[PDB]
Amino acid sequence: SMQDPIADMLTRIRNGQAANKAAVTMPSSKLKVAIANVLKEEGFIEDFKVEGDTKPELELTLKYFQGKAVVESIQRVSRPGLRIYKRKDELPKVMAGLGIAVVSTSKGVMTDRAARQAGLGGEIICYVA
Amino acid sequence: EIDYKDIATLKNYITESGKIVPSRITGTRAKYQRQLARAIKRARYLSLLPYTDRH
Amino acid sequence: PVIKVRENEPFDVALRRFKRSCEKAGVLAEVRRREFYEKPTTERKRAKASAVKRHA
Amino acid sequence: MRHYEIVFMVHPDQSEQVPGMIERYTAAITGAEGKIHRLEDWGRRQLAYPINKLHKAHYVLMNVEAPQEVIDELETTFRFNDAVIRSMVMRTKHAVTEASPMVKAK
Amino acid sequence: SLSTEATAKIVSEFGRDANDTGSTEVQVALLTAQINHLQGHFAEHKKDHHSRRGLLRMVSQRRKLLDYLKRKDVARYTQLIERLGLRR
RNA sequence: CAAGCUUGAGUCUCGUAGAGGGGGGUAGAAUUCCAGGUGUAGCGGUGAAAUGCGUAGAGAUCUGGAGGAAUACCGGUGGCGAAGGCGGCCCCCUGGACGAAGACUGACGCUCAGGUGCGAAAGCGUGGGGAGCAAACAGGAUUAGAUACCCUGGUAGUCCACGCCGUAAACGAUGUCGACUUGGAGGUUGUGCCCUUGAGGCGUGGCUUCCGGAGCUAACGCGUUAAGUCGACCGCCUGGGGA
Ligand SMILES: [Mg+2]
Ligand SMILES: [Mg+2]
Ligand SMILES: [Mg+2]
Ligand SMILES: [Mg+2]
Ligand SMILES: [Mg+2]
Ligand SMILES: [Mg+2]
Ligand SMILES: [Mg+2]
Ligand SMILES: [Mg+2]
Ligand SMILES: [Mg+2]
Ligand SMILES: [Mg+2]
């Protein structure tokens, strides 16, 4: 079943990028929007849009640099089957710092760098590079 | 539309020996070749059509 | 196959007409097939093999 | 109520019982709140192949709308009756009242 | 399966109206009626293993619906089982 | 924890295709047998034979009858089923799938150790049934031998009822459910639309076959029915032999 909506969003991005698709649409959620924000603010996607009221649909405009997709790798870390939580000092850095780790902290969803600056820890949602 | 009573139309889809003619020869649709075969068998039982070219 | 010899038609033509009626009805083919027992697995294997051959 | 197309063929030596059979069959259907839509006495007809050393037999078509109880006793009365050499009751999705190709080919 | 007239009768008896067809009480009663009717079929046709699989699906579906109603409204469940004469 | 929400999952209405299951009828071909007509010296079988059958009249042919088992053609990389498997025709009882349009319930869902049920053939028990086929067994051959392959026979068994057994290369050698990712040609089964239609034109679902792109793979190959990209849960593997 649809037990992991977050891994689905990442897979929709991953497959869309591989299929040279201009955009990817999926059923929306606050958490999907919070991740979409971090992806846009770090230049992994162009822009995101939430259409509808009763059945919200999140659309993400994919980014393509030159002959290639911007998102090289996008993997789910913490998942329903095994939750990954890290302390401020244990926070992981993707590509030795050249990539981002989406962390869910007490003060919201942000990058590994952001949480490190804010002295926070949390659930490691995904790795993006 | 197909009926065992219409031995007029039925006689076109059976051979000289009484055998049902395959869809590959008659060019009929799959759904209706099945409907035909049932009608030919229904008409055969009721002695409206023969089984073999002996009787 | 029931063949009726026509008026002023030679015997050679009537026999050739009969041989073609038997060829059409598959007389010798149905006898070859029924001579010996064939397992359901074997007739299913033959049907699959012939369907593959009917692709050129 | 279900729809049925009954076809029974009577021995030619008993072709006189046929009107009496029709009267009785119709009475059992109408008696059980059932309806009769088509009835066609085809009379003596030539058989495609012989059945019980016979060539020719009396045919009767019937398109009925009746409960499964009277259609069951109709099926048994055909087995029990020696006059009926063959019968076939076929369930139909809807009632039919149109000249069958037997009425039309004459 | 269960007749148009028989199904409609159950919908009225257990539903909020004639159109409240999805109500758990309606659903459980429609399954109860068919499970009970089929008892007669499987008494004569004990070797009908294929149809029995479909009956067991009705039984397992009823159980899942009954357990759902038990946690959502204990009173509505207590009434429903007493109304159709079932333990659990 | 509380209240919801309708997209997941169900319920309802009308239909559609199907060897899906259980029961009861019934039909025509053929084999064997019995009974009779005609007929006369062979038939049958094989690589060749012989065993075997036939002057108590076979085989061949025609007619009548008994009985069992299986359903030619249709028939199709056709269809249905969870798998095993399911095929003449008719009815009765019944399970599933799919489509169209709305309405209803409101996360009721997915998976599943243990548990439970089903489960080809052979085999087992009791009573039936027994035409054909045929383990065993007998005879005739082949061969250096021939406990075989071939031939003539033939018992269990194969068939039915009720129990049992619980296994197969039980295979797609591919666990189930869900989401996402270029295409081409067919087959099958729904349905919306358009024409003067004794057919086609344009869509939109379910299933299925061949080919193939990316990707994947040790390769072979797989390729929207994945063996691709991901997630949930389960089963299982850890060198060969021993086992
Ligand atoms: Mg049904
Ligand atoms: Mg016979
Ligand atoms: Mg509501
Ligand atoms: Mg036994
Ligand atoms: Mg032998
Ligand atoms: Mg024994
Ligand atoms: Mg095993
Ligand atoms: Mg390739
Ligand atoms: Mg391929
Ligand atoms: Mg070892």
XYZ file of C-alpha atoms (C1' of nucleotides) and ligand atoms in Angstrom:
687
model
C 0.000 0.000 0.000
C 0.653 3.887 0.029
C 2.396 3.505 3.434
C 5.313 5.852 2.546
C 4.063 9.051 0.783
C 7.504 10.718 1.254
C 9.514 7.935 -0.562
C 6.845 8.183 -3.300
C 7.492 11.982 -3.716
C 11.280 11.286 -3.989
C 10.626 8.405 -6.480
C 8.242 10.642 -8.506
C 11.088 13.252 -8.662
C 13.795 10.552 -9.404
C 11.731 8.890 -12.192
C 10.542 12.211 -13.664
C 14.166 13.458 -13.871
C 15.249 10.152 -15.533
C 12.267 10.476 -17.981
C 13.272 14.153 -18.806
C 9.753 15.268 -17.654
C 9.208 19.048 -17.291
C 7.120 18.609 -14.080
C 5.856 15.967 -11.585
C 2.377 16.024 -9.907
C 1.354 14.089 -6.743
C -1.361 14.181 -3.976
C -0.257 16.948 -1.535
C 0.444 16.937 2.264
C 2.048 19.528 4.672
C 5.213 17.349 4.962
C 5.492 17.015 1.107
C 5.196 20.881 0.873
C 7.849 21.368 3.641
C 10.288 19.119 1.654
C 9.319 20.859 -1.652
C 10.300 24.163 0.064
C 13.805 22.916 1.114
C 14.325 21.485 -2.448
C 13.410 24.847 -4.090
C 15.391 26.989 -1.529
C 18.520 24.852 -2.280
C 18.103 24.907 -6.085
C 17.107 21.250 -6.708
C 13.701 22.177 -8.230
C 12.423 25.300 -10.110
C 9.086 26.026 -8.284
C 6.210 24.137 -6.548
C 2.413 24.698 -6.769
C -0.489 23.311 -4.634
C -3.793 23.195 -6.666
C -7.204 22.251 -5.246
C -8.840 22.467 -1.797
C -10.586 19.149 -0.911
C -8.060 16.875 -2.803
C -4.805 18.982 -2.880
C -2.327 18.219 -5.705
C 1.348 19.270 -5.388
C 3.171 19.994 -8.671
C 6.979 20.473 -8.782
C 8.802 22.021 -11.750
C 11.938 19.968 -12.350
C 15.382 21.502 -13.004
C 17.719 20.571 -15.917
C 21.172 22.168 -16.208
C 22.984 21.124 -19.424
C 21.995 17.757 -20.964
C 21.452 16.527 -17.346
C 18.905 16.642 -14.500
C 19.903 18.728 -11.434
C 18.916 15.895 -9.016
C 21.789 13.347 -9.500
C 20.714 11.199 -6.476
C 17.629 11.354 -4.141
C 17.322 8.630 -1.462
C 14.900 7.944 1.443
C 16.797 7.579 4.764
C 14.291 7.332 7.690
C 11.286 5.225 6.586
C 8.176 3.606 8.235
C 10.034 0.272 8.521
C 13.080 1.868 10.275
C 13.179 5.443 11.676
C 16.501 7.349 11.651
C 16.939 10.152 14.206
C 20.281 11.967 14.766
C 21.636 14.416 17.367
C 23.074 17.889 16.364
C 26.671 16.488 16.457
C 25.682 13.250 14.614
C 23.992 15.048 11.637
C 25.030 13.563 8.263
C 26.528 15.618 5.414
C 25.828 14.368 1.848
C 28.683 14.494 -0.767
C 31.112 15.817 1.965
C 28.922 18.978 1.984
C 28.154 19.288 -1.788
C 24.670 17.781 -1.216
C 21.877 18.233 1.362
C 20.262 16.029 4.006
C 16.600 16.980 4.666
C 16.121 16.915 8.466
C 12.813 17.278 10.380
C 13.664 19.249 13.589
C 11.603 20.573 16.630
C 11.609 23.939 14.726
C 10.580 22.495 11.305
C 11.882 20.767 8.137
C 15.339 22.106 6.991
C 18.841 21.139 5.592
C 21.712 19.506 7.589
C 23.552 22.908 7.515
C 20.446 24.793 8.818
C 19.865 22.339 11.751
C 23.629 22.443 12.575
C 23.461 26.302 12.706
C 20.228 26.157 14.802
C 21.899 23.637 17.210
C 19.127 21.093 16.459
C 18.792 17.389 15.652
C 15.926 15.321 14.262
C 14.602 12.742 11.776
C 16.764 12.360 8.619
C 14.076 12.357 5.877
C 16.354 12.021 2.785
C 19.708 12.724 1.052
C 19.678 14.945 -2.113
C 22.674 15.598 -4.452
C -29.255 -12.187 -33.193
C -27.970 -15.808 -33.854
C -30.467 -18.703 -33.503
C -30.440 -22.549 -33.879
C -33.907 -22.234 -35.574
C -32.352 -20.275 -38.525
C -30.930 -23.449 -40.201
C -30.779 -21.225 -43.379
C -27.866 -19.047 -42.050
C -26.453 -22.001 -39.979
C -25.910 -24.159 -43.148
C -23.313 -21.562 -44.413
C -20.964 -22.150 -41.431
C -20.914 -26.017 -41.683
C -19.011 -28.275 -44.159
C -20.207 -30.974 -46.668
C -19.562 -33.572 -43.853
C -21.474 -31.479 -41.215
C -18.332 -30.218 -39.317
C -18.369 -26.570 -38.022
C -16.176 -24.355 -40.297
C -13.317 -22.602 -38.341
C -13.376 -18.776 -37.880
C -10.078 -18.551 -39.914
C -12.019 -19.668 -43.080
C -15.469 -17.995 -42.531
C -13.867 -14.745 -41.228
C -16.446 -14.392 -38.406
C -15.853 -12.532 -35.070
C -14.658 -14.593 -32.003
C -17.767 -13.784 -29.878
C -20.170 -14.908 -32.644
C -18.204 -18.074 -33.740
C -18.894 -19.315 -30.133
C -22.592 -18.227 -30.480
C -22.699 -20.104 -33.869
C -21.157 -23.350 -32.511
C -23.740 -23.378 -29.639
C -26.649 -22.878 -32.150
C -25.233 -25.576 -34.537
C -24.973 -27.983 -31.483
C -28.520 -26.984 -30.303
C -29.869 -27.561 -33.877
C -27.893 -30.861 -34.174
C -29.513 -32.233 -30.968
C -33.017 -31.249 -32.247
C -32.317 -33.119 -35.585
C -32.709 -29.769 -37.501
C -29.082 -30.301 -38.710
C -27.068 -33.566 -39.094
C -23.970 -34.585 -37.052
C -22.265 -36.590 -39.943
C -22.642 -37.001 -43.818
C -23.520 -40.714 -43.430
C -27.195 -40.242 -42.303
C -16.286 -37.245 -48.350
C -19.150 -38.320 -50.672
C -18.231 -37.969 -54.395
C -20.825 -38.614 -57.158
C -19.387 -39.440 -60.629
C -20.892 -37.102 -63.274
C -22.065 -37.845 -66.877
C -19.277 -37.908 -69.573
C -16.697 -37.256 -66.753
C -13.655 -39.636 -66.855
C -12.731 -41.956 -63.928
C -9.330 -40.187 -63.528
C -11.086 -36.817 -62.786
C -13.639 -38.399 -60.343
C -10.841 -40.083 -58.272
C -8.770 -36.828 -58.234
C -11.945 -35.007 -57.013
C -12.348 -37.651 -54.227
C -8.644 -37.416 -53.209
C -9.095 -33.607 -52.883
C -12.354 -34.046 -50.848
C -10.417 -36.358 -48.408
C -7.534 -33.800 -48.284
C -10.112 -31.024 -47.444
C -11.894 -33.147 -44.734
C -8.520 -34.268 -43.258
C -9.336 -38.014 -43.435
C -5.750 -39.420 -43.304
C -4.582 -36.677 -40.837
C -7.327 -37.490 -38.240
C -6.439 -41.247 -38.510
C -2.670 -40.501 -38.014
C -3.487 -38.378 -34.918
C -5.834 -41.023 -33.326
C -3.603 -44.092 -34.021
C -1.694 -43.730 -30.715
C -2.370 -42.060 -27.367
C -1.132 -38.527 -26.774
C -0.805 -37.114 -23.249
C -2.622 -33.772 -22.464
C 0.885 -32.337 -21.700
C 2.095 -33.440 -25.226
C -0.940 -31.954 -27.121
C -0.536 -28.704 -25.103
C 3.247 -28.675 -25.984
C 2.423 -29.238 -29.737
C -0.228 -26.410 -29.735
C 2.290 -23.951 -28.164
C 5.091 -25.020 -30.634
C 2.801 -24.628 -33.714
C 1.627 -21.150 -32.500
C 5.348 -20.065 -32.284
C 5.925 -21.463 -35.867
C 2.866 -19.392 -37.068
C 5.047 -16.231 -36.548
C 7.355 -15.510 -39.566
C -40.124 -14.635 -13.534
C -37.687 -16.510 -15.859
C -38.156 -16.937 -19.640
C -37.899 -20.343 -21.395
C -37.929 -21.646 -24.980
C -39.306 -25.244 -24.931
C -39.103 -27.454 -28.060
C -40.582 -30.957 -27.919
C -40.768 -33.530 -30.706
C -43.598 -36.132 -30.526
C -43.647 -39.585 -32.301
C -45.715 -39.274 -35.591
C -48.070 -42.143 -34.501
C -49.094 -39.939 -31.475
C -49.508 -36.563 -33.388
C -53.195 -36.499 -32.207
C -52.162 -36.179 -28.505
C -50.210 -32.962 -29.423
C -53.259 -30.527 -29.093
C -54.135 -32.137 -25.721
C -50.472 -31.814 -24.585
C -50.455 -28.081 -25.574
C -53.769 -27.457 -23.652
C -52.372 -29.180 -20.493
C -48.910 -27.476 -20.640
C -50.509 -23.984 -21.159
C -52.922 -24.713 -18.220
C -50.017 -25.567 -15.825
C -48.137 -22.341 -16.814
C -51.190 -19.963 -16.666
C -52.420 -21.732 -13.498
C -49.171 -20.782 -11.661
C -49.573 -17.020 -12.637
C -47.249 -17.672 -15.640
C -47.520 -16.224 -19.163
C -47.193 -17.814 -22.643
C -45.668 -15.467 -25.291
C -45.099 -17.662 -28.390
C -46.599 -21.019 -29.443
C -45.926 -22.652 -32.791
C -47.101 -26.119 -33.840
C -44.641 -26.984 -36.618
C -46.401 -30.301 -37.327
C -44.652 -33.267 -38.945
C -41.094 -32.361 -40.050
C -38.378 -34.450 -41.785
C -35.450 -35.397 -39.467
C -31.815 -34.587 -40.485
C -30.754 -38.020 -39.050
C -32.956 -40.960 -37.818
C -33.957 -41.116 -34.094
C -35.344 -44.488 -32.816
C -35.613 -45.966 -36.405
C -37.766 -42.865 -37.315
C -37.620 -40.322 -40.139
C -40.044 -37.390 -39.440
C -41.503 -36.311 -36.018
C -44.080 -33.741 -34.779
C -42.369 -30.501 -33.564
C -43.823 -27.844 -31.166
C -42.156 -24.523 -30.153
C -43.137 -22.680 -26.922
C -41.815 -19.404 -25.466
C -42.989 -19.351 -21.872
C -42.544 -17.132 -18.771
C -43.139 -19.459 -15.722
C -41.693 -20.258 -12.216
C -38.956 -22.952 -11.840
C -41.525 -25.301 -10.145
C -43.858 -25.724 -13.209
C -40.848 -25.758 -15.606
C -39.420 -28.686 -13.490
C -42.658 -30.751 -13.662
C -42.736 -29.969 -17.419
C -39.194 -31.472 -17.716
C -40.261 -34.648 -15.794
C -43.559 -35.097 -17.738
C -41.369 -35.120 -20.951
C -39.105 -37.889 -19.513
C -42.169 -39.910 -18.289
C -43.985 -39.514 -21.696
C -42.975 -42.118 -24.345
C -44.613 -40.005 -27.133
C -41.995 -37.197 -26.690
C -38.859 -38.682 -28.415
C -36.791 -35.484 -27.667
C -37.281 -32.179 -25.778
C -35.083 -29.160 -24.942
C -35.901 -26.304 -22.558
C -33.577 -23.271 -23.061
C -33.508 -20.284 -20.717
C -33.858 -16.896 -22.620
C -32.927 -13.405 -21.228
C -36.213 -11.807 -22.480
C -39.575 -12.993 -23.920
C -39.915 -13.382 -27.717
C -42.985 -13.203 -30.039
C -41.761 -13.195 -33.650
C -42.358 -15.777 -36.393
C -39.491 -18.283 -36.097
C -37.738 -19.158 -39.444
C -40.075 -22.287 -39.610
C -43.212 -20.094 -40.060
C -41.217 -17.699 -42.394
C -39.593 -20.456 -44.659
C -43.099 -21.767 -45.663
C -26.564 -13.957 -5.283
C -29.062 -12.087 -2.941
C -32.195 -10.803 -4.853
C -32.911 -7.108 -5.754
C -36.094 -7.137 -3.578
C -34.310 -8.938 -0.636
C -31.271 -6.540 -0.705
C -33.544 -3.421 -0.897
C -35.582 -4.684 2.151
C -32.352 -4.981 4.307
C -31.138 -1.461 3.246
C -34.416 0.086 4.619
C -34.390 -1.999 7.896
C -30.718 -1.229 8.803
C -29.972 2.030 6.936
C -30.759 5.688 7.833
C -32.923 5.766 4.642
C -33.395 3.790 1.363
C -30.153 5.341 -0.081
C -27.889 4.740 3.031
C -26.472 1.594 1.394
C -22.856 1.866 2.661
C -23.697 1.880 6.408
C -21.746 -0.858 8.278
C -25.086 -2.172 9.791
C -26.524 -2.547 6.225
C -23.297 -4.213 4.979
C -23.119 -6.721 7.922
C -26.874 -7.639 7.483
C -26.480 -8.116 3.675
C -23.542 -10.479 4.401
C -25.507 -12.193 7.295
C -28.458 -12.844 4.903
C -26.226 -14.400 2.197
C -24.089 -16.437 4.736
C -27.368 -17.872 6.197
C -28.947 -18.500 2.734
C -25.808 -20.372 1.519
C -26.025 -22.765 4.538
C -28.741 -24.561 2.527
C -26.574 -24.610 -0.649
C -23.486 -26.069 1.146
C -25.726 -28.647 3.000
C -26.543 -30.210 -0.433
C -23.248 -29.263 -2.182
C -20.548 -30.126 0.395
C -18.015 -30.725 -2.465
C -18.508 -27.117 -3.778
C -15.065 -25.985 -2.498
C -14.842 -23.076 -5.016
C -18.084 -21.389 -3.919
C -17.132 -22.034 -0.257
C -14.041 -19.776 -0.756
C -16.487 -16.974 -1.729
C -18.641 -17.692 1.350
C -15.534 -17.611 3.621
C -14.745 -14.198 2.056
C -18.289 -12.995 3.141
C -17.582 -14.425 6.672
C -14.102 -12.744 6.946
C -15.488 -9.476 5.476
C -18.390 -9.466 8.046
C -15.895 -10.050 10.923
C -13.662 -7.079 9.802
C -16.738 -4.761 9.548
C -18.080 -5.977 12.978
C -14.688 -5.314 14.658
C -14.555 -1.858 12.979
C -18.043 -0.968 14.329
C -17.072 -2.377 17.809
C -14.320 0.276 18.277
C -16.149 3.159 16.514
C -19.502 2.721 18.467
C -19.829 -0.072 21.147
C -23.648 0.526 21.521
C -24.387 0.306 17.731
C -22.344 -2.965 17.615
C -24.087 -4.477 20.746
C -27.469 -3.715 19.081
C -26.442 -5.101 15.624
C -25.161 -8.531 16.884
C -28.302 -9.007 19.070
C -30.462 -7.934 16.039
C -28.908 -10.520 13.631
C -28.353 -13.197 16.336
C -24.569 -13.529 16.308
C -22.027 -13.994 19.098
C -19.083 -11.504 18.524
C -6.485 10.964 22.514
C -10.667 13.780 20.138
C -13.433 15.514 15.892
C -13.245 15.073 10.874
C -12.107 14.501 5.409
C -12.832 11.343 0.488
C -8.702 10.326 -3.074
C -7.507 4.075 -0.469
C -11.055 0.066 0.792
C -15.962 -1.455 0.849
C -21.905 -1.307 -0.051
C -25.912 -0.352 -3.739
C -28.431 -0.176 -9.257
C -28.205 -2.012 -14.457
C -25.596 -4.931 -17.655
C -21.386 -8.109 -20.151
C -17.954 -12.344 -21.347
C -16.209 -16.936 -19.487
C -14.106 -25.325 -20.129
C -14.964 -21.020 -12.527
C -17.508 -24.713 -8.829
C -21.600 -28.487 -7.098
C -25.930 -31.447 -8.589
C -29.384 -33.684 -12.018
C -30.853 -34.836 -17.020
C -29.596 -35.921 -22.048
C -27.071 -36.609 -27.299
C -24.322 -38.490 -31.318
C -19.539 -40.835 -33.249
C -16.366 -44.829 -32.223
C -14.204 -49.343 -29.660
C -15.523 -54.099 -27.317
C -19.325 -57.661 -26.608
C -24.068 -60.424 -27.740
C -27.837 -61.842 -31.540
C -29.058 -62.640 -36.680
C -28.573 -62.054 -42.768
C -24.888 -62.384 -46.856
C -20.170 -64.456 -47.811
C -15.493 -67.885 -47.785
C -10.511 -68.802 -46.329
C -8.005 -66.322 -44.275
C -7.524 -62.440 -40.358
C -4.213 -60.033 -37.043
C 0.610 -58.440 -36.147
C 5.987 -56.979 -37.259
C 11.788 -54.460 -39.502
C 10.856 -59.716 -40.513
C 8.287 -63.024 -37.432
C 5.876 -65.866 -34.133
C 2.580 -66.357 -30.017
C -2.863 -65.231 -30.998
C -7.849 -65.519 -33.790
C -10.651 -68.533 -38.015
C -14.165 -74.141 -41.609
C -17.705 -75.140 -33.972
C -17.388 -70.098 -40.394
C -13.310 -65.671 -38.422
C -11.827 -61.152 -40.777
C -14.765 -58.204 -44.302
C -20.160 -56.353 -45.074
C -25.302 -55.344 -43.426
C -29.113 -55.214 -39.463
C -30.843 -55.239 -34.365
C -29.316 -54.971 -29.128
C -26.240 -54.506 -24.288
C -22.542 -51.808 -21.682
C -18.640 -48.563 -20.124
C -15.600 -44.494 -20.889
C -14.473 -40.044 -23.399
C -16.678 -35.707 -25.747
C -14.304 -34.934 -33.210
C -15.419 -30.338 -35.810
C -16.080 -25.396 -33.217
C -10.751 -24.719 -30.959
C -7.832 -20.039 -31.195
C 0.359 -17.660 -27.841
C -8.947 -18.263 -27.096
C -11.321 -18.060 -22.133
C -12.142 -18.985 -16.566
C -10.105 -20.090 -11.617
C -6.027 -18.538 -5.570
C -3.209 -22.552 -6.996
C -4.224 -27.615 -8.219
C -6.788 -27.437 -12.433
C -11.571 -26.664 -15.759
C -14.014 -28.526 -22.696
C -20.594 -32.101 -26.217
C -25.629 -30.244 -25.129
C -29.801 -28.678 -21.482
C -31.576 -27.117 -16.710
C -31.155 -26.105 -11.306
C -27.989 -24.279 -7.051
C -23.644 -21.112 -6.581
C -18.328 -18.300 -6.444
C -15.298 -14.666 -8.711
C -13.975 -10.829 -12.538
C -15.132 -6.442 -15.517
C -17.797 -2.021 -17.512
C -21.285 2.499 -17.213
C -23.723 6.198 -14.060
C -24.566 8.309 -9.653
C -25.601 7.491 -4.369
C -23.920 5.540 0.436
C -20.043 4.105 4.555
C -15.913 7.177 6.091
C -9.074 4.633 6.500
C -13.233 0.160 7.749
C -6.442 -0.604 4.618
C -1.663 -3.752 3.211
C 1.030 -7.933 4.893
C 1.014 -12.190 7.897
C 5.080 -16.384 12.215
C 1.627 -19.706 14.663
C -3.503 -21.549 13.024
C -7.213 -23.096 9.245
C -8.854 -24.540 4.508
C -7.805 -26.170 -0.669
C -4.449 -29.065 -3.277
C -2.468 -33.097 -10.323
C -1.228 -38.171 -10.754
C -0.012 -42.467 -8.382
C -1.334 -44.980 -3.870
C -4.805 -46.743 0.520
C -10.077 -48.445 2.830
C -15.438 -50.131 2.059
C -19.166 -51.018 -1.644
C -20.316 -50.427 -6.717
C -18.730 -50.243 -12.071
C -15.528 -52.148 -15.916
C -15.914 -50.823 -22.964
C -10.949 -48.990 -24.219
C -6.124 -48.371 -22.145
C -2.620 -50.726 -18.925
C 1.851 -51.289 -13.636
C 2.320 -56.626 -12.137
C 2.227 -61.317 -14.507
C 2.118 -64.983 -18.746
C 3.418 -66.197 -23.681
C 5.902 -64.872 -28.611
C 10.389 -62.229 -30.526
C 15.017 -59.279 -30.596
C 19.947 -59.854 -28.433
C 26.238 -62.051 -26.698
C 22.671 -61.614 -22.619
C 17.470 -58.763 -22.811
C 14.303 -59.673 -15.931
C 13.708 -54.217 -21.533
C 12.500 -51.414 -25.928
C 8.580 -54.540 -30.234
C 4.205 -58.192 -30.617
C -0.183 -61.314 -28.506
C -2.741 -61.439 -24.011
C -3.766 -59.225 -19.399
C -4.735 -58.097 -13.128
C -4.611 -53.885 -10.059
C -5.584 -49.235 -11.599
C -7.884 -45.659 -14.727
C -14.671 -44.673 -13.822
C -18.808 -43.654 -9.492
C -20.124 -42.743 -3.953
C -18.069 -41.764 0.816
C -13.513 -41.534 3.599
C -7.956 -41.209 3.565
C -3.149 -39.498 1.686
C -0.945 -33.970 1.266
C 3.063 -34.861 -2.576
C 5.013 -33.047 -8.482
C 10.038 -29.771 -13.141
C 2.805 -28.270 -7.595
C 7.190 -23.811 -12.939
C 6.765 -17.757 -15.007
C 11.912 -22.656 -11.533
C 10.003 -15.129 -10.700
C 5.846 -14.173 -2.762
C 1.781 -10.499 -1.851
C 0.027 -5.249 -2.061
C 0.698 -0.149 -3.682
C 3.003 4.280 -6.463
C 6.106 5.899 -10.486
C 8.943 5.426 -15.639
C 9.747 6.164 -23.944
C 7.366 3.027 -27.748
C 5.463 -0.642 -32.047
C 2.250 -4.715 -33.843
C -1.608 -8.055 -32.739
C -5.591 -11.266 -29.737
C -9.704 -11.164 -26.276
C -13.755 -8.781 -23.310
C -16.743 -4.032 -21.614
C -18.309 0.899 -22.777
C -18.999 6.582 -24.589
C -19.320 8.802 -29.505
C -19.955 9.422 -35.223
C -21.834 8.119 -39.976
C -26.998 6.223 -43.461
C -23.547 0.701 -42.075
C -25.063 -5.720 -45.243
C -18.609 -1.913 -41.814
C -15.874 1.217 -40.570
C -13.940 6.487 -38.071
C -12.524 8.730 -33.018
C -11.931 7.830 -27.897
C -11.999 5.284 -22.865
C -11.582 0.776 -19.146
C -10.321 -5.037 -17.742
C -7.254 -9.123 -19.427
C -3.649 -11.237 -22.858
C 0.675 -12.421 -26.923
C 5.007 -11.091 -29.717
C 8.853 -7.301 -30.331
C 11.668 -3.446 -28.205
C 13.785 1.919 -25.491
C 16.022 3.639 -21.125
C 17.440 1.190 -16.963
C 18.812 -3.486 -14.977
C 21.691 -8.247 -15.457
C 27.553 -12.520 -14.840
C 25.620 -13.353 -19.248
C 21.390 -15.311 -21.205
C 17.869 -12.192 -21.049
C 13.891 -8.863 -18.433
C 11.807 -4.506 -20.258
C 4.611 -0.369 -17.773
C 1.878 -8.136 -17.056
C 9.994 -5.557 -14.969
C 14.192 -9.077 -13.651
C 13.499 -0.825 -14.238
C 12.697 3.210 -10.103
C 10.851 3.025 -4.848
C 8.043 1.688 -0.258
C 5.230 -2.126 3.510
C 5.109 -7.037 5.361
C 6.255 -12.229 4.959
C 9.026 -16.913 3.251
C 13.908 -18.451 2.326
C 19.666 -18.970 1.189
C 25.019 -19.029 3.347
C 30.643 -24.383 -0.631
C 29.981 -29.809 -2.834
C 28.953 -34.674 -1.001
C 26.868 -36.820 3.578
C 20.961 -35.351 3.440
Mg -22.629 -14.833 -11.260
Mg -22.382 -48.543 -30.463
Mg -19.815 11.742 6.323
Mg -9.773 -47.685 -5.013
Mg 1.904 -54.597 -23.850
Mg -5.566 -53.100 -3.895
Mg 8.428 -29.715 -2.469
Mg 19.313 -3.166 -24.158
Mg 11.396 -8.040 -24.610
Mg 28.726 -28.143 3.405
